[PDB]
Ligand binder design. Structure first.
Ligand SMILES: *[C@@H]1O[C@H](CO)[C@@H](O[C@@H]2O[C@H](CO)[C@@H](O[C@@H]3O[C@H](CO[C@H]4O[C@H](CO)[C@@H](O)[C@H](O[C@H]5O[C@H](CO)[C@@H](O)[C@H](O)[C@@H]5O)[C@@H]4O)[C@@H](O)[C@H](O[C@H]4O[C@H](CO)[C@@H](O)[C@H](O)[C@@H]4O[C@H]4O[C@H](CO)[C@@H](O)[C@H](O)[C@@H]4O[C@H]4O[C@H](CO)[C@@H](O)[C@H](O)[C@@H]4O)[C@@H]3O)[C@H](O)[C@H]2NC(C)=O)[C@H](O)[C@H]1NC(C)=O
Ligand SMILES: CCCCC/C=C\C/C=C\CCCCCCCC(=O)O[C@H](COC(=O)CCCCCCCCCCCCCCC)COP(=O)([O-])OCC[N+](C)(C)C
Ligand SMILES: CCCCC/C=C\C/C=C\CCCCCCCC(=O)O[C@H](COC(=O)CCCCCCCCCCCCCCC)COP(=O)([O-])OCC[N+](C)(C)C
Lengths: 167, 112, 110, 41, 34
């Protein structure tokens, strides 16, 4: 489904056929292996699939069920931190390139809202996403996405010669 | 060696103080005055009032819609006081299955 | 370069944009009083010196920040609609997102 | 202590502000959805 | 129960049937799509 969101589905079946039997994932996915990365990658790919599917169309629902599988990815594995430094790294690279839209706001800001009020309920991860140095990229991009939203309101309303002296 | 030994009583940790209570009462009715300011701003004063009410045969899907929206907050409000996660989960299942059909025929009935 | 044209001009565009569409009035005044509840809780944490539960503060605070977030994410879909998403599908997703945020914030208040 | 066997949020004198504000956002949300549906744009 | 060489033949024949019908799907898709 992820590669179906990147290209046509005929590349999705190649990616599924690759990751079904690849030796890099079958190492940590052997038959007797209850070692907590058996459930991690099957939530990394559902998380990323609903994130890309939420950022294409700008839907609120796909970015809330991206955050439910983000929460259920936090409940499982301790390398959830990767996601909360990759989805903000994606959105931020969407800001520097000038590819901001209302879809990118309307996806990211509800991903951060639901996914950060929800991942705080696991007792191993307490108020750490408020005061850890690795969850600050998400609160930083959640910070400046407001400024790009309001600035994006004033750029499309005042003329270009006064708009060039703003950014 | 043998003989009597001095006692030990395990001096406990101190708990941080809670709050002065009428300060908390003051902020409770400040938030009450703010929410009542919101409702009194909505209903008549800013004229964002009830322009249309579907009094036809699609009124029952509107009352079903209010039954779902108020119903999930009744379920969550019961979950706030006791009421373990499984009985809440079957409660919102038994509301969410008939309730999603009568909250979608309504939004099919209104194209705005 | 005093930016006197900015606040007056955007004041005319926004302040003209409010009463032409009756639903954006609901959205932005409800956003404004959400900002007032965030300010009231923040000055409660300033007025006394402790944040003693600290899950109650982030419960009552992240419900207001998150609800403001979902309201802006609906106003952006009513002002200029997204391609694959209708205006009625713009609203049910707000309802589902708001009910999920209300559940997690009533779980996090304990 | 279990997660249930804690001092409750309505019991504690400090958390009345946040219960009142969460209840305010919820009731104002219910009048927001009923007022939003029943208005005409 | 199945042996280990017979499981090796089963795993390899699922891999070969898998990649074969993937290539057939990609050929039929790439030829007959606008
Ligand atoms: C990871 O695992 C680790 C290993 O399993 C674990 O580490 C261990 O943790 C425990 C728990 O804290 C440690 O026990 C404490 O150790 C203290 C160290 O004191 C040193 O220095 C003192 C002089 O400054 C020495 O007296 C002391 O003991 C020596 O003498 C003993 C008798 O002669 C002898 O057996 C020893 O081998 C050693 O030679 C040591 O060298 C120690 O001070 C402390 O004792 C107090 O607490 C005990 C109960 O916890 C009481 O039984 C004891 O009598 C002392 O009580 C005082 O404190 C209580 C409250 O804490 C009060 O209720 C008492 O009334 C009393 O209070 C008096 O003193 C207070 C000042 O301290 C004062 O405020 C009061 O008013 C009153 O005057 C205890 O034994 C242990 O040492 C650690 N071991 C190692 C190897 O590190 C670690 O905890 C684990 N990690 C986690 C996260 O759990
Ligand atoms: C529009 C529809 C909206 C419906 C909303 C429904 C869900 C919202 C989505 C996400 C919410 C996230 C918050 C988690 C709440 C549950 C915690 C709980 O249940 O444990 C709580 C205790 O907490 C905890 O220790 C933390 C436990 C963390 C749970 C870890 C499991 C996650 C993985 C589950 C997936 C399993 C496979 C399923 C595959 C799909 C028990 O509570 P209790 O039984 O004591 O109840 C009494 C309620 N007092 C106490 C408030 C009165
Ligand atoms: C999502 C699709 C899933 C795709 C495949 C998934 C997993 C396959 C991977 C590994 C499988 C290897 C098997 C290891 C165990 C060895 C046992 C063995 O080999 O049995 C062999 C024989 O078997 C067979 O003739 C197989 C028979 C036909 C198989 C039919 C497929 C089952 C599906 C039916 C479901 C229909 C319902 C439809 C619902 C919609 C004998 O063994 P025995 O001597 O121990 O019997 C004990 C000795 N008696 C004989 C005396 C009892």
């Amino acid at each position: 489904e992820f590669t179906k969101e990147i290209k046509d589905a005929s590349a999705g079946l190649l990616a599924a056929g690759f990751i079904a039997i690849v030796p890099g994932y079958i190492s940590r996915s052997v038959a007797g292996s209850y070692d907590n990365e058996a459930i991690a990658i099957t939530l990394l790919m559902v998380t990323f699939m609903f994130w890309i599917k939420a950022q294409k169309t700008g839907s609120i629902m796909h970015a809330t069920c991206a955050a439910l599988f983000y929460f259920y990815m936090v409940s499982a594995w301790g390398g959830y931190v990767f996601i909360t430094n990759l989805i903000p790294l994606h959105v931020f690279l969407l800001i520097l390139m000038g590819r901001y839209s209302s879809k990118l706001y309307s996806a990211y800001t509800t991903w951060y809202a639901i996914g950060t009020v929800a991942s705080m309920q696991i007792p191993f991860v307490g108020f750490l996403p408020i005061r850890s140095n690795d969850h600050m990229a998400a609160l930083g991009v959640f910070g400046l996405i407001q400024i790009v939203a309001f600035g994006d309101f004033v750029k499309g309303q005042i003329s270009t010669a006064k708009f060039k002296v703003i950014m | 060696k043998f003989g009597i030994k001095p006692e030990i009583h395990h001096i406990f940790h101190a708990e941080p103080k809670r709050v002065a209570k009428p300060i908390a009462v003051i902020f409770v009715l400040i938030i009450f005055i703010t929410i009542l300011s919101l409702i009194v701003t909505w209903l008549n004063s800013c004229a964002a009032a009830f322009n249309n009410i579907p009094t036809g045969v699609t009124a029952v899907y509107f009352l079903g819609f209010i039954a779902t929206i108020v119903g999930f907050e009744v379920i969550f409000a019961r979950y706030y006081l006791g009421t373990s996660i499984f009985e809440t989960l079957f409660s919102s299942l038994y509301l969410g299955a008939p309730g999603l059909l009568t909250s979608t025929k309504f939004l099919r009935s209104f194209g705005q | 370069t005093d930016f006197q044209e900015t606040f007056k001009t955007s004041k005319r565009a926004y302040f003209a944009q409010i009463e032409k569409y009756p639903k954006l009035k609901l959205i932005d005044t409800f956003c404004f009083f959400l900002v007032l509840l965030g300010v009231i809780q923040c000055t409660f944490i300033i007025l006394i010196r402790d944040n003693f539960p600290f899950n109650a503060f982030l419960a009552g605070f992240i419900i207001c920040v998150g609800q403001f977030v979902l309201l802006m994410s609906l106003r952006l879909q009513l002002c200029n609609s997204f391609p694959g998403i209708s205006k009625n599908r713009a609203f049910a997703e707000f309802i589902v997102a708001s009910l999920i945020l209300h559940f997690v914030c009533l779980h996090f208040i304990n | 202590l279990a997660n249930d066997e804690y001092p409750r949020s309505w019991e504690i004198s400090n958390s009345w502000v946040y219960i009142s504000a969460i209840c305010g956002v919820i009731v104002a949300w219910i009048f927001f959805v009923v007022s939003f549906v029943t208005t005409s744009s | 129960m199945i042996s280990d060489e017979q499981l090796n033949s089963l795993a390899i024949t699922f891999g070969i049937v898998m990649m074969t019908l993937i290539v057939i799907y990609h050929a039929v898709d790439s030829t007959m799509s606008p």
